[PDB]
Amino acid sequence: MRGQKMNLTFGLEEVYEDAEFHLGDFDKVGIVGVNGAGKTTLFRLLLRELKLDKGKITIGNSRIGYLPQEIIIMDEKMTVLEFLAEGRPIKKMETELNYIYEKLTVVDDDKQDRLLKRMGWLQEQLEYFDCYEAESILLDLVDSMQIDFDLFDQPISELSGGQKSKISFAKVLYSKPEILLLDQPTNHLDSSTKEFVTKYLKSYRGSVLIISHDIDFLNQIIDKIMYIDKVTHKISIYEGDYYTYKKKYSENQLLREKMIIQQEKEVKELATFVQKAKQASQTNHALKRMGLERAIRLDKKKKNLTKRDKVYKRVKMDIKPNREVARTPLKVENVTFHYPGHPILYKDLSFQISGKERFLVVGENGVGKSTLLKLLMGINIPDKGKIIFNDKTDVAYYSQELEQLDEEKTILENVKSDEYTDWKLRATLSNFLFYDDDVNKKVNVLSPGEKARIVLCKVLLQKANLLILDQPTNHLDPETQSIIGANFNLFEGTIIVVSHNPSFVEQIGINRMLILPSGNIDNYSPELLEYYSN
């Protein structure tokens, strides 16, 4: 994999500017960058989906296994087995091959040569992707991540975010690829599932490029780290792990900063003398002469004076509730719920939040965490029981799968509210790193991370006193995650949160944790680990 003089500019905002990179074979490269840096765009260039405006991007002829950052569900009714089966081209070729036989009967002596060649390749190609896979895939689920066979016959759209990630990851492995391009392979996975993915990637003999915002996950796998810069629009490749990249990078910006400082001092020195000559008496001929001579050096200095790159601005969040929390914000009493045709997730579930409380809904993948939160908002109507919100409680919902954005509309149109004027919307969008005409961009072209900021911005603009957040740190760059956690910690309201990120929950400072599926309203503590172990 090699790229030279890479250039790419969507409209007025550019991604790559004369960027270059060379990746040797059998390198587990960790791709790192802030949201929008252009990490996903790099893969699109490798997959030839995009074309560089200028430059050459070189890819090996080997087959590539691509794990998209977003799940591709062509139709809502697609079953998990259909989704997985689409990983291999067995079905596609057979449909073509079946048609080839039909053409052979219709045509006698005209197209036989073309048909016979096409049939031969399909058979040879079909045998290369040995048709025994029908059994291998069935057992690949068992050995991979303990994916139950009941899910195997269930619509994919109905799976949980963690479950979908397992299916998509298995599909990539099912294709039997030669190069692995994983775009956030552990976005929704729980702690247990991440262990399997880590072990497989350690053992994987081939080259694997990983886009991840999980530093610990990368450090266990990565041997080479590629950093996509958002301000310089360039690519830098280091040898080592995430910390080594940070150490090397921090030193380089320090050494660059000192260079720019000394160039400024010399310019100031000349400038100070030029001014002294400029204001001297016209009768001081020699000083006036020397002043012009230094004016020439000053001009040449100012034309070779390196500009310091503008440090990328970090998100600023100030979430405050309009009204005040009550001692009983939310009352859940004897609530039972089941998805039609499936086992009851919880029976007679009853809990009561206290107000300005950090409430963690713990659990594992596919256990009902997101279902419970959907239950409170009203997306799911409880099969039994009642859910009562105090009239003083305003609720803000952050969905897990980013289902609250209109892909067709722009960023500004999505955030439009009756309670906020235009400049207020722009100011807040600037606090979320959407500057100037970046707000007129369609949501369909944004990255998952940038979309997550829009959803968060929507949550902030509500000024609710109860925050129902379902995996908020997902898709966010590591810097933005810490900002998110710190500001929530200071939030003066009730927080119902779900998070598989250990760092995020620690910053928020959880008070009570609700374990699933075994309903257990418990005080928060390192005993969270005990429930995870058990």
Partner: protein, 48 residues
């Protein structure tokens, strides 16, 4: 930001016309119906 651009005939890929556009006002590649002297007929010309 205003910059000069070239409009190329989508049919024969001939760089036929020279114009300019403001990137901010027209972020997407400009397209016009212009006479293509090589093909001697009006065709869709898109910016490159």
């Amino acid at each position: 930001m205003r910059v000069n651009i070239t409009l190329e005939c989508t049919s024969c890929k001939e760089r036929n016309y020279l114009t300019n556009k403001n990137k901010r006002n027209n972020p997407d590649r400009l397209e016009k119906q212009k006479y293509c002297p090589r093909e001697r007929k009006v065709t869709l010309h898109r910016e490159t």
